[PDB]
């Protein structure tokens, strides 16, 4: 196969938001392959080398006052601005999950929801099941939806009622799917 | 944190390939098609709510190329070490015969951002309605990528996501079947 050497440059301009846009942290990061060599942290206010290979850049960049001036205003002109621009379809995005219960071991598959924050609980005869419950964890489908599977190992009694209950920001109340043995 | 918006870019030599995208909480908002010079929204609906001058992105990629050359020399031409992808194939929804679903080939934790992904149905390549995402950034600075294959679940079909990456000696095949 192609074994020619590869050289990669990555740049990440990050905007970390806390409590809405009350607190915003802007990071201007530069990577050589996977190694970050220089970065501007708004909590620091200037470029700082992360590795010796970055020192050269951190020096020349801090030397430009119009440059540091731009970076220092980034939390507002960049982060807060973009946050405002995309808020309605990112921050406020709420897609409700579909819940499917099927016999595997009972599987509760919660699919297509957004955001990721979700609570999935297994109930047996109206009591929450804790032991014998396994979750695949949160899964990012890559299309702005998540899915997760929560399994319940059990031995149903005559006509036992199992309930998978989901709580999610998109729903006013829990979403319930009941399966009767 | 509650949310993180990241403008991630990369330039790779000798491939001369580049990328410019915006990530929100791990999901791609959009990426720039540098040839057509257009903003490619991850979800079409996004284009109705916001805008972005795709062309402005070329300025960044131009600088990134320049920086790559400077850093390449500074590192005394130290190449990247391939990091093979861990591949997972799952369905986006529970599987039911005759109910359209989508096979998701999750290619994760790899670098460099170059991969050949093929879908095989019963050992033969399938392209019908397939789609993929560009290379998504990871906090460890490796990459994630998604490939999709819509399909009609059948007890008679078997699928494989075949991934070729320089971190692998041979194509990696992740199997899936009903």
């Amino acid at each position: 196969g192609d074994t020619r050497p590869r050289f990669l440059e990555q740049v990440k301009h990050e905007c970390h938001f806390f409590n809405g846009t009350e607190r915003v942290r802007f990071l201007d990061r530069y990577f050589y392959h996977q190694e970050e060599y220089v970065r501007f942290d708004s909590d620091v206010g200037e470029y700082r080398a992360v590795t010796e290979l970055g020192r050269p850049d951190a020096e020349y960049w801090n030397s430009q006052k119009d440059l540091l001036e731009q970076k220092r205003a980034a939390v507002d002109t960049y982060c807060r601005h973009n946050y405002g621009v995309g808020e309605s379809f990112t921050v406020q995005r709420r897609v409700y999950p579909e819940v499917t219960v099927y016999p595997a071991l009972l599987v509760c598959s919660v699919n297509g929801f957004y955001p990721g924050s979700i609570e999935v609980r297994w109930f047996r005869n109206g009591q929450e099941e804790k032991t014998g419950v396994v979750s695949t964890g949160l899964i990012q489908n890559g299309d702005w939806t998540f899915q997760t599977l929560v399994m319940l190992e059990t031995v149903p009694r005559s006509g036992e009622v199992y309930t998978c209950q989901v709580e999610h920001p998109s729903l006013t109340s829990p979403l319930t799917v009941e399966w009767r043995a | 944190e509650e949310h993180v918006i990241i403008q991630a870019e990369f330039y790779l030599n000798p491939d001369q390939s580049g990328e410019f995208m915006f990530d929100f909480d791990g999901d791609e908002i959009f990426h720039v098609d540098m040839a057509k010079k257009e903003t490619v929204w991850r979800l079409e609906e996004f284009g109705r709510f916001a805008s972005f001058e795709a062309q402005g992105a070329l300025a960044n990629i131009a600088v990134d190329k320049a920086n790559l050359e400077i850093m390449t020399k500074r590192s005394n031409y130290t190449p990247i070490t391939n990091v093979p992808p861990e591949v997972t194939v799952l369905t986006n929804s529970p599987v039911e015969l005759r109910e359209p679903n989508v096979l998701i080939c999750f290619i994760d934790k790899f670098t460099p951002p170059v991969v050949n992904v093929t879908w095989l149905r019963n050992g033969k390549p399938v392209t019908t309605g397939v789609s993929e995402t560009v290379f998504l950034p990871r906090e460890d600075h490796l990459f994630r990528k998604f490939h999709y294959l819509p399909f009609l679940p059948s007890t008679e079909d078997v699928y494989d996501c075949r991934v070729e990456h320089w971190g692998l000696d041979e194509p990696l095949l992740k199997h899936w079947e009903f």
Binding site: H13, F26, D28, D57, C79, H81, N82 | F22, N60, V63
Partner: peptide, 6 residues
Amino acid sequence: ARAXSL
């Protein structure tokens, strides 16, 4: 959206 590379 506003783009922010040195």
